[PDB]
Amino acid sequence: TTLGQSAAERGRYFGVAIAAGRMNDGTYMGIVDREFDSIVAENEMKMDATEPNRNQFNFSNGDRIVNYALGKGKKVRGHTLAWHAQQPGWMQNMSGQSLRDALLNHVSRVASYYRGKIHSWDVVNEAFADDGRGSRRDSNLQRTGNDWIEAAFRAARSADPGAKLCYNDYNTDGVNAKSTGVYNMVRDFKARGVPIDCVGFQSHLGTTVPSDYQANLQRFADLGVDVQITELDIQQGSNQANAYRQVVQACLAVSRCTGITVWGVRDTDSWRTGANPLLFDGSGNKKAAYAAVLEALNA
DSSP states (O other): OOOHHHHHHOEEEEEEEEOGGTTHHHHHHHHHHHHHHHESSSSTHHHHHSSSBBBBBBOOOHHHHHHHHHHTEOOOOOOEEEEESSSHHHHHHHHHHHHHHHHHHHHHHHHHHHHHHHHHHEEEOOOOOOOSOOOOOOOOOGOTTTTHHHHHHHHHHHHTTTTEEEEEEESSSSSSSHHHHHHHHHHHHHHHHHHHHHHHOOOOOSSSSSSHHHHHHHHHHHHTTTEEEEEEEEOOOOHHHHHHHHHHHHHTTSTTTEEEESSBBBBBGGGGGGOOOOOOOOOOOOHHHHHHHHHHHHH
């Protein structure tokens, strides 16, 4: 088997983040053809990639990833319709109502273009502080109004109602002040019928999985949302393979945990240079962490 085969047999997907740049690399494209049944774009679908100038869109590189995914029978995750980081320059300098207008225009148009091709959308990415109080990150977006996360989900449901609408964030893997700030927002969203289907957990780990990784996953699924591990990577070390095997078993244990996406093919492809935090090495070979993931999917 492969990761994707044996994660399907558990009712789940195993995805990978790819970059257009590498799609000519023969051994890279091979591993992706075979091991994963879900695909994210690493950069080609962010705000600056898709709307370089106000109200004017280029989906050229994002499409090369999406259409490769559909052509080979794989699911597609959309990353990401709204995010303080990596805003096209014209957007960084707007504020207020017109920023709010520009933001919703971005979400409905991007989600419209990809309607029917997107298994799930990171609608809003990283909206909570890392300050031990679970408060909102101060952003030009957040300064338009505390309800901008709601408005963004509303615009995305309109544009593509078949897509699963996710909130995605990092430093949210255990039970901390940040996951509980996310939790309270989502709870209120589900209370009020705000259209949010899944919560994403980036899980950019150090060397070790939190004791309550699954307890935190589970408290969210109990809200009646799906949970997804969206951008997984684990710092290398002797506990690396143990840490991957634990993340997979925490997802199999939770019934609403639909799948896991690691954030790159090979160690050399990682935004986290030097960490070697992935399932393959630069020579393209399976690491120990690959065998841990494949067993955990099978045991």
